[PDB]
């Protein structure tokens, strides 16, 4: 006995943890309608030249139309003179960040991969198009659209469908073997990795690192000092201080909880978790991990928080070499 | 010998000129804004509120602002109005809302009409969002700063909302248009001055540590906490090398309250706390020193961005002269 | 399975019995206190105040409490009442004062008398100090704890001050003794319940996150900040090995609001914020669960010891039933 | 180039004159204080302590101070003195007490008598409180500041307690009155200087980062923590607009150790740590620079309000020359 | 809320690392390695002077061939053999001021105060290791081939050597010697009384260097036990060697030396202490091999505990 | 005006001369250092690594440095080179290691050899320690500072390790000795400059907020956090009164990167963040202003000691001109 008091759950409990955010009864119909809504919007793919140049790759700006009639951007890097269809890698970035430096993924192009890195709407990248909502609250981007009449105007639903469209576009490229596409990302990018592999089940491998956007109600109940999950509390303090609508708010967040999309995943998943992480508590991550629909494995860093995890990029690189 | 301060010594506050650039066409921008507002029909709708009391008729006041959105304000009026009487406009703090109905019933008991605006997208009922060409989630204060022209700034729409509220209230048949005042704390203090500037008929104005003044001075001071950090948050997202620093701060000059201050004709009573690190006193005096009407200030040397004992009585006594 | 929390899970709050022991002679202690108070002539003096408004007669109310000290309260009365009318007693926060005259004028406009006590030695006009045998600067709350008998506790005098103020207001010719209410925040919330217990004729009581409850529970939680840390400060100074732990907390039981709550006959509306680490919800419900009259509560799950939006309207609506 | 410091650069410390006024009747105030003290019979009572050791006779010493209050000091005497010998007076830190008997037995082994005062109301055995006309719980340091005359200041009673202890110890038959020293840390350092000023016969004085100097300088500084913040607490409670700022700091000049420093004739060895934000070096040098006897200082550049390695040996070597 | 264990469970708490199976053999080899190193004791005058004592620098050779320093204070004119007191200082500090122990010399005692290797005193000799990591002094040597190069072992053997030297002094009654210290000095007090069990009394205050695995598991924000986490983050981020690291640390855990202690122990502990959690201290207290009592300060942390110096002084007068 | 800063205003950064003394025999010290290194046979051993990829040949590079210790570096070479090609030396942050193999494979795909040193005793495979006469656990940076001569400084061994690593890579058969670069962050930035100074054949250098510059300036500043506080930690342990301050800082001048900067002939691209309180900009420009070759800088005004978006692309483009 004599187990100390952790802010989160003991590891033995994590592997059986079922989550604590309600799954709406019409979850499957919600996402089929979302995928149908997306398919009814013509992608209108335009590929435009980039300023960054190197003999290692062809660098481009990839533009497409997402739900809400918004133009969305992704960095696109393709190998010079490909001869046979080859793998591709989709990368997703952290909350409020952007797709990052071109040169950080040139080694994947050197392996022969196409790499596409999405810029999330309104964050630090080139996606600057905003879909409207009926009820605008400045309190929270994560909860944008939560007060609309129907649940289809959630900002995170547009974001998830953006990842689905990017995967659809990349898979359809003639140079890309549709059976050899992977996804990876940190934090928000980890959650988007799983949402992408769920809405495009053709994805073969997925490597999220401490994924964000899981188990919203568990995150709220833990009363975390810092981090983006505090947007939930900020919204409540602004628009429902007595929590009269608590059940309706969390039932709608259940539509965009990655843990309830996880059963659709067919990719093999390699998930990295650090146990001192108070930004993405391990319990919220394993809520999604435990519901994954394909083969899966995890890597633990007991003494680390939401930071660089030494050796993980090599582990992911070796994992993605099997594509 | 002068002692060290995080801000400026009080001696230099009274002559401080501000450090945020004034665009050469400031006047044309705001004249164009008021003309744009006047070209949108107000479409005023007044509906009863659930809160009831024998002290006041409480209503929801709805109108259309710039950008094609509906805006809400609380409206409190005497039950059986007789002669035309004074009115008071109130503006709330950043991310808050117009607050409790009962906190202003004593002004109605004096015979005043009270109107309290809900700022767009904040904690109240104004939930309509004007679109922008370039959306950044980094900052509401800088929303619209990357559009082609400076007419899509979110702060511009907000200022014109206060102008419309003043116009509607002054036009009410039971309101003497020469006996209208405005007051507010923090963001509400900055909106009080913007309102008294864009509707110069306002007779008295009582801002408390006003926000939204001297943006560039605020950015240069390195403030650990507070809403002025939204400027740094934006630069970190969309211009980390400050290649567009001059253009961003020039555009912000359009919505810097200090440059609207010369239009104010109301008598102003401004309350300032000297240990305030959310709205540093220097940013407040940048606007105060440019005021176009009579003015006086009240200081709280040992207080920060908090409740200031005696200020509500000072404002009430000040507003009794309406 | 319930999630971790710094306090108790909400489902355990409504059955929580407290931890500070109830003294066996609690009744005799408080009957003796009321007898001690009655044996001191109140010596009521009412003088006009500087603050003036057509909405109310404003006055300074002075009386003598236990220990022979003079105590002050703000007094606001309707300008021309005919029949007996309601009254409202207000109590302020720890180390604060009765506050601004104008923040209570809407109650006078309803026809109420309003009386707002200034606590001894705090930020108001009550500056008289009752002596003690053993003085420790470590804690105001524990002042008098080391005297021979328990009748010199500084909190006892304070509670009897609220009782005397209620007695004076009920005895006023134009105050209906059946239509008196009490309300207050934090320290004022605990004083509201102490007042309604020692003057059970009070009809309504509206405390907000009440202080001065369940002293032992507060000490055992070891909070980072707040006035409950005065208990720890006293122990570190005058009993570092806790040789007198039981005598100290049994003494505090006399001035624990939770053990006066069974005397309350007023209907109580209690507001609680669940992230409050100044007054933990468990200590508040120790008193709530022992209340002797009708009762209801209002929760703010994500708020701490701060402004609670809607609470002033909720209290105003509650107090309109006077 | 002088790098930026929170306090003053060291070159300016040696000429720093202080920033707290100095009353024109300072000398008359303190001559009256000593005469008031002499008019109260000491009524010295000495009883054995439970702590026992063959190295010393350990006793409790009780006397009456100004205000009709009983004051305690620890008294340690050599077992076989035989001949008149030196004595050492020790004063303790703010809110503490005189500390362990065994921490000063090496001075008794030298042949010295040791007396260690317990400050009124702090963690020791001095629990008697002198009354004031106007009680504010905000600050012990400013207790008495609002009375009619300035003779009820709590710090004045404390300073006169150190003088009485010195007078009692010097009059002992086995104490050579010209071989008496004083020493202490923080509050005890300020009391060391006040004692050597009010009993100028004291030969050596060893303060360590002394407290209770240059109150106005401390207030003007951005002190995040420490007992000097009691001044701000008082202003926030009883004078938030600083209308009485000049009166308050003029009265504090009576109990500022820096203005007692010219009376000191003892040789002083002062220890200062330069990163100290509790007692800023500038406030200490305000007193040091005005000292009336020979003096030297010891600097610890990288230390704050903490243990200073080597200082107790330095003081011991200094006090062996008694 | 309950940061540590409730007091009700402290007196039965067994610690979080099992006694190594060859613990006795490890320390018999350590003491034998020490005995094979000549002490080469040198005593030199110190600058601090007082009529109350002779003050000296005491130098000797410890394991690893380094020179180790202790302050030595002796009565000026002793007649018969008399008691002695050994003192140990806090982590990264030094033996402190000469004058803080003159009252023990005035009782007639010899006082010896060790300076720990590499800390703030005069012991500046460093024993080499095969694998050097800058992350942690406490775990220095943990990655060498055998466990005999642990820096903490050298430190423990220094206290044993100092005690052996002091007991062997002609004017010291070897059966009237005590040890005391705060924090690291409290743990060294216990190690000293274990490796030289002739020590009669021991008075540790919130002892350090106990129950390492429990300390790491508690995720303390702050303080010297965080060196364990710092080492793991540097040299084993996935904890592949977790079991070998902690069971190597069991050799230098003071709790497993506690059964050798025969001195009467007076342990002072403060209950709000987050630097040395009470549970880790009672892991050692519960295994002590001699008479024992404790003193509690419920509202205090890792700070001065009023009355403790008088309690220890009264306790040590029975020497 | 008055733009207060924790560091120096940017106008003065470009002229700042440093504050740490340069020893008069600086040139002789480092020529002796290079000669001592040359007298130790490098005994280079290259072993295959376990990380594998078709993009590169990955190996462990081992050599002997000063003090008779074995040092490790990660070595990545392009598979089957047909002509001499460029090489890149990378240095890591304080207490870190050379990092993941795959983070530099894109340079190998360009045709470069990459060598990444592991600093002695840090998180990598270099675990050999050179002995010192006087060991203090207070500071690795100041290790060896108390020895009789200055040739035992730990920083000197570290700097000579970079020289040997550069010498080994420059001497490789398939490496063009005229096309070698160095780059690194923080400690790796200082090592980048030390390397290009002790091996002046280095062609390009790209440090990011370099560490190990202007030790005295670093100590003189506030700086609550960061590795520069090891200086204060050492002083608090081994020189609390600063009696040896001039000796300590004179010795640090031998290993202060600013005084090796005049030897640099590489073109330097230095990246600086202006809110960096770990490596203050003034300390970095002390070295930059003394650089002996072509140079340019990149600024991030709102960033601290963190990831600087765009910097890896900027360095990559810079290194493509190799
Ligand atoms: Na394809
Ligand atoms: Na009108
Ligand atoms: Na009545
Ligand atoms: Na005498
Ligand atoms: Na012996
Ligand atoms: Na070559």
* Diameter over CA atoms, chain C: 62
Domain A1-323: CATH class, spelled out: alpha beta
Residues whose CB falls within 8 Å of the CB of residue E73, separated by 6 or more in sequence, listed in order: E53, E54, E55, E56, E98, E101, E102, E104, E105, E110, E111, E112
Ion ligand 3 contact residues with beta carbon within 5 A: C 172, 175, 177
Q: Give how far the C-alpha of residue A151 lies from the chain's centroid of Cα atoms, to the nearest Å.
A: 19
The ligand placed nearest to the CA atom of residue C166 is: 3
What are the DSSP E strand ranges found in chain A? 46-49, 58-66, 70-78, 86-92, 114-118, 176-186, 205-209, 268-274, 296-301
**CA-to-CA distance for F272 and E54, rounded, in angstroms?**
58
Task: Among C100, C105, C313, select the one facing B51 at the smallest CB separation.
Answer: C313
Does residue C57 sit in helix, strand or coil? strand
- DSSP string for B259-298: HHGGG--SEEEEEEETT-SSS-HHHHHHHHTT-SS-EEEE
C235, E307: Cβ pair inside 8 Å? Answer: no
Of B160, B142, B238, the residue nearest B197 (C-alpha): B160
C-beta separation of E245 from E271 below 8 A: no
3-class DSSP string for D172-234: CCCEEEEEEEEEEECHHHHHHHHHHHHCCCCCEEEEECCCCCCHHHHHHCCCCCCCCHHHHHH
Map tokens 């951005």 to a residue: D222
The DSSP call for residue B301 is T
Cβ atoms within 10 Å, residue F224: 7
C-beta separation of D194 from D211 below 8 A: no
Active site residue E239: no
Which chain A residues touch C275 with a CB distance below 8 Å? Answer: 223
Does residue C300 sit in helix, strand or coil? strand
The order of strands in the sheet holding F85-91 is: F45-48, F57-65, F69-77, F113-117, F85-91, F175-185, F204-208, F267-273, F295-300
- DSSP string for B2-57: ----SS--HHHHTT---SSPPPTTHHHHHHHHHHHHHTS----EEEE-S--BTTBE
Burial of C147 (0-12, 13-18, 19+ CB in 10 A): middle
F106, A102: Cβ pair inside 8 Å? Answer: no
Domain residue spans of chain F: 1-322
Of A112, A93, A254, A251, the residue nearest A162 (C-alpha): A93
Fold for domain E1-319?
Rossmann fold (3.40.50)
**Residue D128 dihedral angles phi and psi, to the nearest 5°:** -90, 135
Task: Among C100, C106, C312, select the one facing B313 at the smallest CB separation.
Answer: C100
CA distance F266 to chain A (A): 23
**CA-to-CA distance for D295 and F83, rounded, in angstroms?**
77
A147, B138: Cβ pair inside 8 Å? Answer: no
A222, C299: Cβ pair inside 8 Å? Answer: no
Q: Which helix (H) or strand (E) element contains residue F86?
A: strand F85-91
CA distance B38 to chain F (A): 39
Which chain F residues touch A317 with a CB distance below 8 Å? Answer: 53, 100, 102
The DSSP call for residue F3 is -
Q: Which helix (H) or strand (E) element contains residue B165?
A: helix B154-171
B309, C123: Cβ pair inside 8 Å? Answer: yes
Residues whose CB falls within 8 Å of the CB of residue F273, separated by 6 or more in sequence, listed in order: F209, F281, F299, F300, F301, F303, F304, F305, F306, F308
Task: Among A122, A134, A147, select the one facing B135 at the smallest CB separation.
Answer: A122
Active site residue D273: no
Cβ atoms within 10 Å, residue D262: 16
**CA-to-CA distance for B162 and B300, rounded, in angstroms?**
28
The sign of the dihedral angle between the CA atoms of B222, B225, B230, B234 is positive
Query: Looking at D186, D214, D256, D282, which residue is catalytic?
Result: D186
Residue C241, CA atoms < 13 Å, CB-side half-sphere: 9
Locate D97 and state its tokens: 């007490």
Dihedral angle computed from the Cα positions of residues A66, A67, A69 and A75, in that order, rounded to the nearest 10 degrees = -20
The sign of the dihedral angle between the CA atoms of B126, B55, C61, C152 is negative
Of B77, B159, B75, the residue nearest B116 (C-alpha): B75
Q: Which residues of B are catalytic?
A: 186, 276, 305
Q: Which helix (H) or strand (E) element contains residue B69?
A: strand B69-77
* Diameter over CA atoms, chain A: 62
**Residue C59 dihedral angles phi and psi, to the nearest 5°:** -145, 160
A242, C3: Cβ pair inside 8 Å? Answer: no
The sign of the dihedral angle between the CA atoms of A261, A266, A270, A275 is positive
Bridge partner residues of D114 (DSSP): D76, D88
Q: Which helix (H) or strand (E) element contains residue F57?
A: strand F57-65
Of A142, B102, E16, A279, the residue nearest C313 (C-alpha): B102
The ligand placed nearest to the CA atom of residue F85 is: 6
Q: Which helix (H) or strand (E) element contains residue B164?
A: helix B154-171
* Gyration radius of chain A's alpha carbons: 19
Of D282, D284, D240, the residue nearest D6 (C-alpha): D282
Question: Chain D residue with minimal CA distance to B275?
Answer: D222
Q: Tell me, in angstroms, the distance from the centre of ligand 4 to residue D76's CA.
A: 15
Task: Among A7, A218, A241, select the one facing C303 at the smallest CB separation.
Answer: A241
Does residue A259 sit in helix, strand or coil? helix
Q: Tell me, in angstroms, the distance from the centre of ligand 4 to residue D108's CA.
A: 16
Residues of A with CB under 8 A from a CB of E: 2, 4-6, 276, 299-304, 309-311
Of E134, D275, D226, the residue nearest F232 (C-alpha): D275
Q: Which helix (H) or strand (E) element contains residue F45?
A: strand F45-48
Cβ atoms within 10 Å, residue B252: 24
Q: Which helix (H) or strand (E) element contains residue A159?
A: helix A155-171
Which chain B residues touch F298 with a CB distance below 8 Å? Answer: 241
Residues whose CB falls within 8 Å of the CB of residue A128, separated by 6 or more in sequence, listed in order: A121, A122, B133, B134, B135, B136, B146
**CA-to-CA distance for B226 and B95, rounded, in angstroms?**
12
**CA-to-CA distance for B174 and E39, rounded, in angstroms?**
103
Fold for domain F1-322?
Rossmann fold (3.40.50)
CA distance F1 to chain B (A): 7
Of B253, B317, B259, B280, the residue nearest B10 (C-alpha): B280
- DSSP string for C92-104: --TT--S--GGGG
The ligand placed nearest to the CA atom of residue C87 is: 3
Size of interface C-E (CB pairs under 8 A): 22
First CA to last CA distance, chain C: 44
Which chain D residues touch E307 with a CB distance below 8 Å? Answer: 100
**CA-to-CA distance for B61 and B73, rounded, in angstroms?**
5
C-beta separation of E172 from E81 below 8 A: yes
Locate A120 and state its tokens: 């999330």
The DSSP call for residue D316 is H
CA distance A54 to chain B (A): 23
C-beta separation of F271 from F209 below 8 A: yes
How far are the Cα atoms of A20, A187, A293 from residue A296, in angstroms, in the given order?
A: 22, 18, 9
Q: How was this structure determined?
A: X-ray
Locate B282 and state its tokens: 């220097």
3-class DSSP string for chain E: CCCCCCHHHHCCCCCCCCCCCCHHHHHHHHHHHHHCCCCCCEEEECCCCECCEEEEEEEEECHHHCEEEEEEEECCCCCCCEEEEEEECCCCCCCCCHHHHHHHHHCCCEEEEECCCCCCCCCCCCCCCCCCCCCCCCCCCCCCCCHHHCHHHHHHHHHHHHHHHHHCCCCEEEEEEEEEEECHHHHHHHHHHHHCCCCCEEEEECCCCCCHHHHHHCCCCCCCCHHHHHHHHHHCCCCCCHHHHHHHHHHHCHHHHHHHCCCEEEEEEECCCCCCCHHHHHHHHCCCCCCEEEEEECCCCCCCCCCHHHHHHHHHHCC
Locate A95 and state its tokens: 């909350």
Which chain A residues touch B146 with a CB distance below 8 Å? Answer: 128
The DSSP call for residue C140 is S
**Residue D89 dihedral angles phi and psi, to the nearest 5°:** -105, 130
CA distance D3 to chain F (A): 7
Cβ atoms within 10 Å, residue D249: 18
The DSSP call for residue F222 is -
Residues whose CB falls within 8 Å of the CB of residue E35, separated by 6 or more in sequence, listed in order: none
Locate F35 and state its tokens: 């000669």
Q: Give how far the C-alpha of residue D214 lies from the chain's centroid of Cα atoms, to the nearest Å.
A: 14
Which chain F residues touch A313 with a CB distance below 8 Å? Answer: 100, 102-103
Which chain E residues touch A276 with a CB distance below 8 Å? Answer: 219
How far are the Cα atoms of E229, E271, E281, E297 from residue E277, in angstroms, in the given order?
A: 16, 8, 7, 13
First CA to last CA distance, chain D: 43
C-beta separation of D237 from D138 below 8 A: yes
- DSSP string for A198-238: HHSTT--EEEEES--S--HHHHHHH--SSSTTHHHHHHHHH
């Amino acid at each position: 006995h004599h187990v100390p008091l952790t802010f989160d759950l003991p590891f033995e409990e994590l592997l059986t943890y079922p989550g604590r955010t309600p799954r709406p009864a019409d979850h499957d119909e919600y996402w089929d309608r979302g995928l149908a809504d997306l398919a009814a919007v013509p992608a209108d793919v335009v590929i435009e030249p980039a300023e960054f140049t190197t003999p290692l790759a062809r660098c481009s700006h990839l533009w497409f139309t997402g739900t809400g009639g918004v133009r969305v951007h992704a960095k696109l890097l393709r190998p010079v003179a490909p001869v046979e269809p080859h793998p591709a890698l989709l990368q997703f970035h952290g909350y409020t960040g952007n797709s990052g430096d071109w040169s950080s993924r040139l080694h994947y192009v050197a392996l022969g991969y196409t790499v596409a890195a999405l810029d999330c709407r309104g964050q630090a990248g080139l996606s600057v198009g905003e879909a409207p909502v009926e009820n605008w609250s400045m309190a929270s981007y994560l909860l944008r659209g939560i007060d609309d009449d129907a649940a289809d105007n959630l900002a995170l639903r547009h974001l998830f469908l953006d990842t689905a469209r990017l995967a659809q576009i990349v898979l359809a490229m003639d140079d890309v073997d549709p059976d050899r596409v992977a996804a990876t990302g940190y934090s928000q990018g980890g959650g988007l990795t799983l949402a992408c592999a769920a809405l495009e089940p053709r994805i073969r491998l997925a490597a999220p690192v401490y994924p964000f956007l899981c188990d919203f109600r568990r995150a709220w109940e833990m009363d975390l000092e810092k981090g983006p999950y505090n947007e939930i509390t900020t919204y409540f303090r602004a628009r429902d201080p007595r929590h009269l609508r608590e059940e309706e708010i969390f039932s709608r967040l259940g539509y965009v909880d990655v843990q309830h999309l996880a059963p659709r995943v067919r990719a093999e998943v390699l998930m990295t978790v650090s146990l001192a992480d108070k930004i993405c508590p391990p319990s919220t991550q394993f809520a999604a991990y435990n519901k994954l629909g394909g083969p899966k494995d995890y890597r633990l860093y007991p003494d680390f928080a939401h930071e660089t995890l030494p050796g993980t990029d090599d582990a992911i690189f070796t994992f993605l070499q099997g594509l």
